[PDB]
Design a protein around this ligand. Structure first.
Ligand SMILES: *[C@@H]1O[C@H](CO[C@@H]2O[C@@H](C)[C@@H](O)[C@@H](O)[C@@H]2O)[C@@H](O[C@@H]2O[C@H](CO)[C@@H](O)[C@H](O)[C@H]2NC(C)=O)[C@H](O)[C@H]1NC(C)=O
Ligand SMILES: *[C@@H]1O[C@H](CO)[C@@H](O)[C@H](O)[C@H]1NC(C)=O
Ligand SMILES: [Ca+2]
Ligand SMILES: [Ca+2]
Ligand SMILES: [Ca+2]
Lengths: 236, 101
């Protein structure tokens, strides 16, 4: 510690103990007056022409720093600027629901929150892996899915034949499809109406109209195709 | 007789639950000798003012620590020349600090 022994530094200078010397330097906010950094004076940030304080402020010089008071009718943006009107008070926002607002000199600025995209006035939810099969991205990394799908990207199909759900019973079979399901008639059944969301549309066909055997009376049945006189068969 | 130009939009690099790293570039038309940079932060949970979190910075990179977990922040940088401070840089994109366990 050479600075402790000799080579004194003035009160406005910081003594830096060195190995091959004992050098003085000024403190932050002070400017050296002599050749060596012996005695230094505070810099006057409020001097004529200096714009350390920016829009709508009044400068106050302190030893080593400075501060800026807002002009009377103005509200503060930061330590160096103020604006005329708080242009985004709460519940009145000119920005989006999922957006931010900070005051600027001469107005305001709107930016969307993390997980959203847009221009502040309108923000849309962003989904990294995206939504699929017609789903919507309602929140950040959250997809809303149509009735027939599920999964974080609406990529999994709901098995409507195994989820209970539709009891495609009676004269039809449940057949799962990507996004929905079918209710297809069993063997020996035809669809009466145009279609139906269940097995109620399927009807028995006249199962020997315009088969059987060369010599066989033909009878109808709910799913049957009967032939008798020789053959005495009982179909389904 | 003019302050320096405004720096470029700062970029967010390292994101923890208590700190954030910033990277900015000086203005292509700086116009006046820059001495240091001033970093300002913004949090909607804190208020509607920009807290000055760093001054006297000499490199174009700085790590703002002492932050709060699970909180949104924004940032901007001012150049500092012989005739005052620059206009603020474009505000950085919003980022949210990580959460604990
Ligand atoms: C902010 O953006 C909105 C909507 O623009 C949309 O989003 C953009 C990111 C881009 O993808 C555009 O192609 C989109 O159309 C602007 O607003 C109008 O919004 C109404 C409904 O809200 C819509 O019917 C109009 O088409 C939109 N007009 C335009 C030109 O897009 C809004 O003007 C933008 N604000 C600013 C300040 O630019
Ligand atoms: C899939 O979506 C359905 C709603 O259609 C929901 O009941 C189910 O819990 C979801 N499953 C998964 C793994 O997302
Ligand atoms: Ca001073
Ligand atoms: Ca299905
Ligand atoms: Ca029949």
């Amino acid at each position: 510690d050479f600075c402790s022994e000799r080579h004194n530094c003035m009160e406005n200078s910081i003594c830096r103990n060195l190995n091959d010397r004992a050098v003085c330097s000024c403190r932050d906010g002070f400017r050296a007056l002599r050749e060596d950094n012996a005695y230094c004076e505070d810099i006057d940030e409020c001097a004529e022409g200096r714009h350390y304080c920016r829009e709508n402020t009044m400068c106050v010089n302190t030893p080593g720093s400075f501060m800026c008071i807002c002009k009377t009718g103005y509200i503060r943006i930061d330590d160096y600027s103020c604006t005329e009107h708080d242009e985004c008070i709460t519940n009145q926002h000119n920005c989006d629901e999922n957006a931010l607002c900070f005051n600027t000199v001469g107005g305001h600025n709107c930016v969307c929150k993390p997980g959203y995209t847009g221009n502040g006035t309108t923000c849309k939810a962003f989904c990294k892996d995206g939504c699929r099969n017609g789903g919507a991205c309602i929140a950040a990394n959250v997809c809303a899915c149509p009735q027939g799908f599920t999964g974080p990207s609406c990529e999994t199909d709901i098995d409507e034949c195994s989820d209970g759900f539709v009891q495609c019973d009676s004269r039809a079979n449940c057949i799962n499809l990507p996004g929905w399901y079918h209710c297809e008639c069993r063997d020996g059944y035809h669809d009466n109406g145009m279609f139906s969301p269940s097995g109620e549309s399927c009807e028995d066909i006249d199962e020997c109209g315009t088969s059987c055997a060369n010599d066989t009376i033909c009878f109808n049945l709910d799913g049957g195709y009967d032939c008798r006189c020789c053959t005495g068969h009982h179909h389904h | 007789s003019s302050p320096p130009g405004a720096p470029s939009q700062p970029v967010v690099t390292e994101i923890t639950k208590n700190s954030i790293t910033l990277t900015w570039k000086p203005n292509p038309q700086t116009g006046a000798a820059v001495t240091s940079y001033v970093i300002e932060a913004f949090s909607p949970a804190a208020g509607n003012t920009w807290r000055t979190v760093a001054d006297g910075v000499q490199l174009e990179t700085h790590t703002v620590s002492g932050l709060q977990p699970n909180t949104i922040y924004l940032f901007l940088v001012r150049a500092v020349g012989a005739w005052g401070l620059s206009e603020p840089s474009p505000v950085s994109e919003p980022v949210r600090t990580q959460d604990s366990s």
